[PDB]
Design a protein around this nucleic acid. Structure first.
Length: 139
RNA sequence: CCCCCCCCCCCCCCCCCCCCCCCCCCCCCCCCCCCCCCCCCCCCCCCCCCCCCCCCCCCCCCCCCCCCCCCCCCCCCCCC
């Protein structure tokens, strides 16, 4: 993907990806839509979406993602229009989704089916509970 | 100067088997859209038929009144 300065739409859905190299998206400054759903992604390297300063739509549904952290999704979640991370095994813990749930609480990005398909998986106390109802007052 | 036999390690290639990953096809279930047919409920429309009510018309019947015509009967007076 190097040198594709004018790339706008990238679709990499359902390729079986387990890990993403940190510097695969570094040249894609004008990228607006990236689709990475239906892969096997769980852990992402930090600063992998740093150069995506014009990203408007991120799709990561039906992956194995458990934690959404600022060091990875910070620049990606800056100015979005649509977010799609629905069917993921979210780990509802203060070090996994606390920044993400705070971001969900105040944001203008459209997140469809937020109250139904964003469900905790672990710990068993939270299994099945909505991610948006996680309480961060004791973090 | 010259062959053969063992040892370790590195390989190459052809098969077998097991793994993840993906594609295509199919099956099961569910959902959505469309089409067709059918049932149920309610509000109606038009037409036909039957019945009833009101009003009116025409005809007829019964009774009564008026006029005209006709007939009978009673008083009274003259003419020859």
């Amino acid at each position: 993907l190097k040198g594709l300065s004018h790339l706008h739409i990238l679709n990499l859905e359902s390729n079986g990806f387990d890990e993403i190299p940190v510097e695969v998206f570094k040249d894609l400054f004008e990228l607006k839509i990236i689709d990475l759903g239906l892969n096997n992604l769980n852990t992402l390297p930090a600063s992998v979406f740093n150069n995506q300063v014009s990203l408007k739509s991120l799709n990561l549904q039906k992956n194995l993602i458990t934690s959404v952290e600022k060091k990875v999704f910070g620049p990606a979640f800056r100015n979005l229009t649509e977010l799609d991370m629905r069917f993921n095994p979210f780990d509802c813990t203060c070090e996994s989704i606390a920044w993400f749930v705070n971001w969900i609480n105040e944001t203008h990005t459209n997140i469809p089916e937020l109250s139904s398909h964003y469900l905790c998986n672990t710990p068993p106390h939270y299994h099945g509970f909505p991610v948006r109802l996680f309480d961060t007052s004791s973090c």
